[PDB]
Amino acid sequence: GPLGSATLSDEAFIEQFRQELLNNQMLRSQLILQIPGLNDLVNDPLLFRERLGPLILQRRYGGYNTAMNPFGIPQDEYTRLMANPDDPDNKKRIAELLDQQAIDEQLRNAIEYTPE
């Protein structure tokens, strides 16, 4: 089955990252040029974390992840629509979901040239 492992925290990701450089002589060698004192930080676990923490995390972090549907409906629901939007039932869901936008669209432009 899936049996993934997407959950490498800061220490988990940084702790494992340190093993990569130590496991890959070629990869590390490329960093030694940009970070000559790497062999030093690597030799130390605490420093490798603190000293090279902001560097390794810079890649992981960058912006909160997101992928919600525009119809604003339970992730489980959206899947049912695209999974079978031809179902006489789904049509109703996708039908009303667009209707709301049409109604709200009127407020956006609001042909009412008299706020008061």
From Swiss-Prot:
Its main location: cytoplasm. It is found in: Cytoplasm; Cell membrane. Induction: By DNA damage via PDR3. One of its GO terms (cellular component) is cytoplasm. One of its GO terms (biological process) is positive regulation of DNA replication. Transmembrane segments: none annotated. There is a cross-link at K91 (Glycyl lysine isopeptide (Lys-Gly) (interchain with G-Cter in ubiquitin)). Keywords: Aspartyl protease, Cell membrane, Cytoplasm, Hydrolase, Isopeptide bond, Membrane, Protease, Protein transport, Transport, Ubl conjugation. It comes from the Eukaryota. Forms homodimers. Interacts with RAD23. These interactions are mediated by the UBA domain. Is also able to bind ubiquitin and polyubiquitinated proteins. Interacts with the SNAREs SNC1, SNC2, SSO1, TLG1 and TLG2. Binding to SSO1 is promoted by the phosphorylation of 'Ser-49' of SSO1 by TKP1. Aspartic protease. Appears to act as negative regulator of constitutive exocytosis. May act at the level of secretory vesicle docking and fusion as a competitive inhibitor of SNARE assembly. Acts as a linker between the 19S proteasome and polyubiquitinated proteins like the HO endonuclease and UFO1 via UBA domain interactions with ubiquitin for their subsequent degradation. Required for S-phase checkpoint control. Present with 6510 molecules/cell in log phase SD medium. Belongs to the DDI1 family. This is DNA damage-inducible protein 1. It comes from Saccharomyces cerevisiae (strain ATCC 204508 / S288c) (Baker's yeast). The lineage of its organism: Eukaryota, Fungi, Dikarya, Ascomycota, Saccharomycotina. The chain holds residues 86 to 196 of 428 of the full protein.
